[PDB]
């Protein structure tokens, strides 16, 4: 099935701008549905769990400060190839670099000892399955219909 | 003090239509808090207990079916008179008689055997209270700095 | 039935000015769904027809001319209550006494010897069948399904 | 003359999904004309002869039956090198390739049998003119000045 | 003649917050005309001169406070009834008693000492042309033609 | 430093068409911070001042026609490497060419005699500096927070 899951991270610099909102929108409207989504204060622990790969990194103490500075809404987009497509949709690591037309490239620029990028976004599928397991649970991840889903049935 | 919180939910057909982030933008532009959020499916139980004002009205059943439907946002807002400004800013009841500007107002038309209307806002800041405990545990509150917030102290 | 049809022209100020998009988009958020619509060029006979309940008036002649000043967008909007409802959409008829949140309020003001107001809207279920079939032939009007019309049935 | 006109479909899903409006406001605001515009709901015959180059391929069915499920809105934007303009708008083919920022790219991506798309756009200036006359009669086409016409006159 | 001049002020807060360019974008929406714009830090008695008819009330100090806290963006409206127009699209003082549609219903709230409310509008003719004395020379206000004139124009 | 400040130009066919507000608003988003601003009517003097690297061209003429046909608003943009960032937003010159979410991507296509693009934006940080010294005085440069600024700094 093309159909995936990827893990979504609206980071401090976006929450405390007040861009929650907007970000969703952009998934919403591309036809990405929101399975699991909520706001939580990620500690230094999690924070390193899901940054795991950094871990050996110069910037990786400046990425926890970072990313567990304020709370943040994590959520997970369903969706025909979700996770490259979202990845698109988030533009380069550094936002001074992203496209206009991208979440990093439209909101983003200003950084501090980390790369402030508005969100994360899992970068494979199987960082996606790992990901979503650190911040949700089963229980917290739903199954329904969209609107518009019934237009793309295939007959 | 003039802060409150406030229990809003976005409704059944908001999510269906994806105005999940439409709608929470338009609390951010105001100025308002996002100090709690989650994205849960609310069974009769819980709904009951939310409506409960309204368990000796004729729309009743309908009303637990339609919050039941499908997941929903539940949010809690804070602000200065959040309570009132929200109901504010949500509109009439019924969305034919909300006010363009408002949500209902512009995101609300169409009813099933319930009336239909985007969102859920808390009418006091007692009801508030109340409803937030329902959906809320202390440790799913937050308090931190909005961007702004250093303008306004004295 | 509540649901109801009425017909809106966006007129040539909004046409000009490039708002068609704009206007549609407000209807189509509401959940009002487009069963006919089509660019045209009104002229004076047909405008005539339209407006006829203003023909004894002294703005008549500037109205007339006016509206067929640029082609126009005339469409029908189908929806509960959509008469009244896109008239309370539209606001005031003078675009300075229209509230904000209105189309009429948001997006128009300025006037020629006509009071120019961005779109026209049937004030009445009777006036929306006599308008209707005054631009559209049944051919021109569809009914299909909306993305979430299926969440409203029973 | 750089003035050119394309022929453009916002397709079913678009229309189901109440996307009209939206799409044709990044016309407009591009500066583009709208010289003839209307809902109709395109019939087999209609649907295979505007796509008659892709009648001998293995999709072909698919789509037919996608621009046909529920009415469309045909309309005939005008304006400097419309044809290539309206085309870059549009964004790549498969929705989930194309760019942030176009109309596929912001507002496309799941599929049924057929690439479900958002819009159509004529993708040369003959394929423009053999499209517009299939939709258009030219007492539907208009010579209307816009707002800002009048700027661009060259003195 | 309908066509007045009224004089809008950015607010310190409407600047912090980035909200310079929506608020300019609902004034070019309607139709109303940038003759006249700049930003600008007013000093306290700049401030006092605008704000004349409040010396005697007990916020004053703490509006002057407020209205130089940071850069601004003065800007002159030209167009018909200008005035009360922008008064109307501005809303009520106090943002949380602003209804939705309006500038200060949809991104005002939070307050200081001061009332915080994004903008200021001029609140008569006569008042517009004393306040933008003050912060224009006649140089700095320009006649031009916006995309749409002509279409009003006989 | 990464901190730098940029000119912009809010050409005549922007201000015409009434997109000033939606032009500020992109930069604003993006976390760029309005240290100057102002309408202003450019002459030709100061116009061919702005443009002298341009004096010996073909299209000089029309360029100055242009950008003095209107009043103008120009501003001044400070944030991390704005320079280049604001070019990037900005997009190609000739508007056709610019891809979605650019502004001129977005708003610009119909030109004159000289190649309508909605807005200027200083090329180089030199440039940038010779640029923002012909528009603006010192004392109309502001030092002063924006909202987030706070969010960060570098412990
Ligand atoms: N060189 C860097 N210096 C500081 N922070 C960085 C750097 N590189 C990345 N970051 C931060 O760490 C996050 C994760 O890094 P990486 O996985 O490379 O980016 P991406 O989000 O595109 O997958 C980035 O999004 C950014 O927030
Ligand atoms: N008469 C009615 N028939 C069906 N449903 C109704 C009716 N009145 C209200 N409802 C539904 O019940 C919800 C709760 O009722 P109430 O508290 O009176 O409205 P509100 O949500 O505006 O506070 C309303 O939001 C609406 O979804
Ligand atoms: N007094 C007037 N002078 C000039 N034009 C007017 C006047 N009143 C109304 N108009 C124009 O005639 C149109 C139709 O009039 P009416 O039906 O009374 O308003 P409405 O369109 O709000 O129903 C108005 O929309 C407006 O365009
Ligand atoms: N391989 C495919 N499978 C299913 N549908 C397709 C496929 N390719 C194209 N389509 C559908 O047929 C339409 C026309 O095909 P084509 O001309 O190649 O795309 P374009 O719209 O970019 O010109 C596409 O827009 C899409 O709706
Ligand atoms: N009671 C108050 N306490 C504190 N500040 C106030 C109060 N009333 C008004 N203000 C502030 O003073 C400004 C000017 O007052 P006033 O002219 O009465 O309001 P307005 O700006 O709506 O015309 C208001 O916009 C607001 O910023
Ligand atoms: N070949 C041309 N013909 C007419 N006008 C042009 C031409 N090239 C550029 N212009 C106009 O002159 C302006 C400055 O030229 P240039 O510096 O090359 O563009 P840019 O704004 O991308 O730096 C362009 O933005 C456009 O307004
Ligand atoms: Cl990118
Ligand atoms: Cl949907
Ligand atoms: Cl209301
Ligand atoms: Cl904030
Ligand atoms: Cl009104
Ligand atoms: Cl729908
Ligand atoms: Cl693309
Ligand atoms: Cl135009
Ligand atoms: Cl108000
Ligand atoms: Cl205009
Ligand atoms: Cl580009
Ligand atoms: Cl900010
Ligand atoms: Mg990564
Ligand atoms: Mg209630
Ligand atoms: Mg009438
Ligand atoms: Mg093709
Ligand atoms: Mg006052
Ligand atoms: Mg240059």
Redesign the interface.
């Known amino acids: 099935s093309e159909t995936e899951r990827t893990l979504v991270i609206i980071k401090?610099?976006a929450?405390?701008?007040?861009?929650?909102?907007?970000?969703?929108?952009?998934?919403?409207?591309?036809?990405?549905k929101?399975?699991?989504?909520?706001?939580?204060?990620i500690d230094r622990e999690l924070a390193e769990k899901h940054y795991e790969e950094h871990r050996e990194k110069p910037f990786f103490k400046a990425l926890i400060?970072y990313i567990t500075?304020?709370?943040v809404?994590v959520?997970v987009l369903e969706?025909?190839?979700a996770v490259?497509?979202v990845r698109?949709?988030a533009?380069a690591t550094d936002p001074?670099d992203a496209?206009?037309?991208?979440?990093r490239?439209?909101?983003?620029?200003?950084?501090?000892?980390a790369i402030?990028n508005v969100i994360h976004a899992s970068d494979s599928k199987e960082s996606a399955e790992r990901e979503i397991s650190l911040f949700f649970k089963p229980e917290?991840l739903?199954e329904?219909?969209?609107?518009?889903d019934?237009?793309?049935?295939?007959?």
Chains 1, 4, 6 share one sequence.
């Open positions: 401090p610099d929450v405390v701008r007040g861009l929650i909102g907007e970000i969703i929108s952009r998934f919403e409207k591309k036809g990405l929101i399975v699991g989504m909520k706001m939580i204060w400060d500075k304020t709370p809404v959520m969706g025909r190839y490259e497509v698109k949709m533009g001074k496209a206009p037309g991208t979440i490239g439209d909101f983003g620029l200003e950084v501090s000892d402030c917290e739903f329904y219909p969209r609107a518009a019934w237009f793309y049935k295939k007959g």
